[PDB]
Amino acid sequence: MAAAVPQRAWTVEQLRSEQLPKKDIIKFLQEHGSDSFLAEHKLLGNIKNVAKTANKDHLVTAYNHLFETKRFK
Structure with a gap:
């Protein structure tokens, strides 16, 4: 867990889900x-x-762009 990279827990559709x-x-x-x-x-x-x-759609945008530029640590 020491410097464990973010493997997406939820997919694009799972996020967009109002559930x-x-x-x-x-x-x-x-x-x-x-x-x-x-x-x-x-x-x-x-x-x-x-x-x-x-808004949910902005969060899915932020999610996809996160991995696209590796902005995570």
């Missing part, structure tokens, strides 16, 4: 997504504060 909440997605993206990722995509700080202004 799956926005909070645990933002948790995943702030859990390993570094400071520049969190600043540009505004996923830093209090999850709920982000979640009240986070």
Whole structure:
């Protein structure tokens, strides 16, 4: 678990699913997504504060772009 890379837990469709909440997605993206990722995509700080202004489709966009530029640690 010491420097374990983020293997996506959920797929694009699983995220878009209104069954799956926005909070645990933002948790995943702030859990390993570094400071520049969190600043540009505004996923830093209090999850709920982000979640009240986070739309699901933006979170799936942020998710896909995370791995695309390796912005995670």
